[PDB]
Amino acid sequence: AAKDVKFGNDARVKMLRGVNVLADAVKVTLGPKGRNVVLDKSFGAPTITKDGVSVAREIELEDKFENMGAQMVKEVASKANDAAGDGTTTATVLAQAIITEGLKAVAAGMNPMDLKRGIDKAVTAAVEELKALSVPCSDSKAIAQVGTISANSDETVGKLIAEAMDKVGKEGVITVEDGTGLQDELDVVEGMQFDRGYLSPYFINKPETGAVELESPFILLADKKISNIREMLPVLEAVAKAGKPLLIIAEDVEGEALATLVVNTMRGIVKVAAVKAPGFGDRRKAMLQDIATLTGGTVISEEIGMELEKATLEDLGQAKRVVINKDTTTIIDGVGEEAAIQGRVAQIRQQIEEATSDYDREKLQERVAKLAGGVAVIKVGAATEVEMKEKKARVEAALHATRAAVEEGVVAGGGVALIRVASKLADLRGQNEDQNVGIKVALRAMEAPLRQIVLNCGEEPSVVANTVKGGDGNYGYNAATEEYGNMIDMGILDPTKVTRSALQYAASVAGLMITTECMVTDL
Template sequence: AVASGMNPMDLKRGIDKAVINAVNELRKLSVPCSNSKAITQVGTISANADEKVGSLISEAMEKVGNDGVITVEEGTGLQNELEVVKGMQFDRGYLSPYFINKPESGIVELENPYILMVDKKISNIRELLSILESIAKSGKPLLIISEDLEGEALATLVVNSMRGIVKIAAVKAPGFGDRRKSMLQDISILTNGAVISEELAMDLEKTSIEDLGQAKRVVITKDNTTIIGGLGNKKDIKNRVNQIRKEIKESTSDYDKEKLNERLAKLSGGVAVLKVGAATEVEMKEKKARVEDALHATRAAVEEGVVAGGGVALVR
């Protein structure tokens, strides 16, 4: 058409209009993909008729919800595996190995802990004395999440932990800059606590036990912290989830959207890891790519529905 003299911009505008009409017609033909059977079928077809992959994707989506994060990793065995992390997990480990209270597995485990969230570096132990006294009286463990914790403050906490005076652990807050502030706020809502911030004229020395968050359990490894069973208000969590969804819609950056989706998953669903098993490296690459394609197709089907294949949708 352009070769015969048609204006290319007019042609583009025409194509754009036709695309909008075609998409609207396809939406009318689409069928919701909402139950596990339909999700399994889409995953199976997208994975070249591999029913095991389809079932695994369906199980993952069932466990973490449509907003949950599902990642695909290379497994260590021959079989595909599904691992689900319940609760909120972020990639920050313990600040000192001396906090470890499960030496056989090299982890810190805190049952029914209080959680102190601080949006600054802590280096002076005097700022923590008041809250440590309250924690010692309560008999419960304490998790400190802060921008950093160093020097005298860290050394004193380690000594208190090793002597059994207070069961305690400390980790750095996840993220950087404004993203760190947002993630601290997410954790505070999940655990029904407050973020101690100098920007809000809050003094760490005057912090009371009522300002702390709570959870049923916290597990800390060298690299990760998982908060399980946060005692946050369900309505507050729901409002926060809706706020993040709104930010995702308004965001124009793919990177920001990815990070917001991760925050959404941590608050609303959880994280599922699909571990792909294979006998050789070549087979691993092929299977992993297949599982990733199937996962993307299944997510799209759940969001927007499915239409009949084989050119049937085009004919209709």
Template structure:
């Protein structure tokens, strides 16, 4: 690649122009009267910010020599942000001044080395003076003041940040995440939480929340896969004799080992749950060691040479409670020794100090075992502020909920102070309604709105959506509408962009104009369905013939001009409902089942052969399938395998009236079938399972 070269005065002047251009944009944000900067990013909607480093990172100049100057100042802002977390605009102002004065001095004949030494000496003197005049933060009031200044003098945000820092302590981690709804929430996670859920829904103990809750369980932390039943039976017998439940955290639990756990759980022999270990590689090993130390157990690594069949209960960890849902595992009040936990914290802090990678630092901070994480979300409903504060402490007994606000300032129990204090403060600031929900060991949630009689905030599904339209105004309007409804929204301007985005991100749904340059809507729909079968697509068009073509492909259609309520209703209906495909060679049974389900408002399709079932499922890969496990000409497991090949996230409920097919049913569960119904089954039982299965999200 050819290079452009500049010398002497021309080069210096070009670099100076670049430094000045970037600095002028960044310095507009300086101080309490700083202005906002509007940034148009390469993808997505514009961003409004007063953060200096964010502005600096988005500026690239056309002239390559000027861009060198801009990159020098951008690096100053970025390094300041990494080291201090703030002060990036001030650092940019100082960098421009040092560059300009230094350039003038060099042109005047001063040796650059001597000037550098002088700058370093001046920096040391000024830093020492600043440290001598600095005042350490003392207490929560000082935290609130500092946080409010950092938040552009917003006392509400400052109070939230101070509450968060005060709650999690010096070893805790505070993270800010963009929520899927418009609501603002504070979430406190006590103990340890990682993003792996149960391996089978049959471990669930609370069907209403689809959670597995284990009280005072033993915890096995194992590095490798567990597949053989003979490896775990001796350990299971010891756990049963001790009258305790068991959580297994391993690389994976497969085949007969998983089937054994599920069968014992269903028979009520003992409570158990199996989850995959978090992360990968060395970080997985480190997090497994964290969990073992937190719970007072031993992480069973292959290098130790310990066999599962000879493992004593003393090598298992313990906790007061473990809560597992389909996505996360939370270990509360582990049984590890405090000295061991503090030593682990010190080790992680030492690694943090040595780390030079932003990614490594972020992952190390997430591993801090003695803290929690807090997120704050707020919303406005037609001008009305709605605030919800949630913590995960000890919770409040049902008998105490009615009088929970009476002892507001005298209650000392750790874990509920944050919810009470923050909610009470908001209630006093504005006359309004304050509601509380809680249960023991699960924390409490307070919901406040400033005026009684207003309509409560509507819950939204918080879907990940993609809007595809070649008209910028249409993209922008839909983006705003869907964001207000609480959805996460990305935008694309062509079918090609849409297909690439879906392939990389697998959103819940796509709203797409049917006629666009390049790849048309229907062709893009076919490629989207191939890349992500469980992503629903809604077409938008003003042409009736195009609408018919879209419906023939199995997609829903919104007519243009668009109606806001119609958009929201169709999205909710499309996301929440699935057609039901009944696969059974008994025509009388199919007819009876179709009448029952159609009477409940379900869209029911019938397939009497495997070929009919596969053909329909290719067009409707989101369909919920009721599959008879004994069909003429094919085994149910073969059909289940074909369905899973078409869509790995397919929701399939097995049916059978033959006891000899019990092993097939168990194998079906290992293939991630949702569940099974034994014929003849009760109608209420079937409908209850279908309602739960309908809520099964895209994986």
């Protein structure tokens, strides 16, 4: 394209404008008194929403430069939600704050690199402080309390989570499914989960949540790199004859002919999803075995002279359901052979006993944990299909909030934790003055979420912030009841992981953007 190139402050004002549109649109929804946002749809009537993630998804600007600013913050802030299951809007609010004051200082002649070092330092210390402020959430009593809090004070949801976690471990794999009636059901089943997402976003299925569900799919295990459809057609035909969907777990699927056809062609004729095999090197092969035995299928390895051209249906494994997302694949009910699965777990258990290094032992037991761990399936029952569907959503939300809570504890919600740790860091300094203003920039930015929340309440944000800061510990402002108090006692908290991810990612883009001297885009 002939390009349009901008440098320094020119590129600065451009990015700031794009960020302000994105942040201002999204932040109106912040807090219990958050306002609505109308998103036009050609499909029919507009959508009125308060989900800041939905709003962000719709933000695209006309000016190429401003749009670059917005798309940058959107990409990083989204990583927060992916990591902690929440944090995107807060990440956006913080990012806008750091970027606004950062660029002001830059334009005032301060050194961008120093400013960033200062911002980065304040964030390091602040994360330490949050870690210290964190209230743990380990015992089943705590787990349930967090669960119900997340489920809008639903004692039943908290119970479900706590029960599932107890029956499968706090770091065990738990799924949520539709109930068969009024009563909730919970049953551990043969399954597994690995950190590998879909190869193509175009594999997204009915689940609007950005995931893909496959009922009774055929699992295809091939440690080869499939770039062409030719040597896979026979399998595809057989699968098609079965009418069942397919899950391709290979070393990697290349977008030359395979991923191309699998997506561009299979837009209705079949249901095929593809993901990379877990791990690398030799472990990649071993793990595929675990998955194979688990699903009862066999792996096609060129090493053994296995040919996908001859891969029959009996080679393919199967599971009651499979759910894949951005960065994870969960095999819910492997049709494997109980004894076979137990045999492998034992085989690996033996290998662990005869391990000659910590690294070997560690990875070895991570594998047995997956196989021997199983999947806990929660079946949300209710009186009506509507209630059932609504409760199910609540359970899914509470489950992600609670898991984050068990991992890093919990902290005063309502934007109070950030304003708390910030008030502590008032004496923090750096290698020099620029670095110092960098530190101040971040500390002041940490007050943005609470001030926004109080803004939507029709209250004075600088007065409430001033008050909350003067307090100590988990003392804050409850925007729901609009009264001060102990945030934790008032049941207003966030998993420390989301507040952390939000701050870190926010500081990440803010740092990159503050140290950007040139922007290039098509005319």
